[PDB]
Amino acid sequence: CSCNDINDKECMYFCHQDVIWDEP
């Protein structure tokens, strides 16, 4: 997962989700 510009709640959400995307 990659988060820095975004918040922790959203970060962890898709972190265990493993969103290998960038543009949805």
Q: Which two tokens stand for residue 18?
A: 């493993």
What SS3 state is found at 3? Answer: coil
Q: Say how far residue 7 (Cα) sits from the centre of its chain.
A: 9
Confirm if 3 and 11 have CB atoms less than 8 A apart: yes
Task: Output b/e per residue, 1-24; b: 16+ Cβ within 10 A.
Answer: eeeeeeeeeeeeeeeeeeeeeeee
Method used to obtain the model: NMR
DSSP string over 4-21: SSS-HHHHHHHHHHT---
Q: Say how far residue 15 (Cα) sits from the centre of its chain.
A: 5
Alpha-carbon distances of 9 from 3, 15, 23, rounded to whole Å: 10, 10, 19
CB proximity list for 6: less than 8 A, separation 6 or greater:
none
